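User: Hi! Is it possible to get a structure for several chains at once, not just one? Here's what I have:
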Amino acid sequence: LERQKKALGREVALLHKQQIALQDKGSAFSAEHLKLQLQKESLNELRKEC
Amino acid sequence: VTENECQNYKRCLEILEQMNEDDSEQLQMELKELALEEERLIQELEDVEKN
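Assistant: Yes, the chains can be modeled jointly so their relative placement is included. Here is the combined structure:
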């Protein structure tokens, strides 16, 4: 029982770490996509001017 | 050698004579307690495995 409990604790810690990492990665991805959208709009405007 | 062994056996019979016989009721109580402990430990182990 004691050895299994130790293993459980280690697994729980690792899962928590991974979940937080996933959340951060998703937020960064959304921000990057929004930036790309705005950049393409600006590029279209510059094309008109040229 | 034979007399020495006889004396050793006398000593061992003395040490046995000093002893008594244990009660069955207390042993039964301990057995029931151990059974309950084993059952609860099994349940805990299954819960840990599922987690």
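The radius of gyration of chain B is 22 Å. Helices of chain B lie at 2-18, 24-50.

User: Great, thank you!
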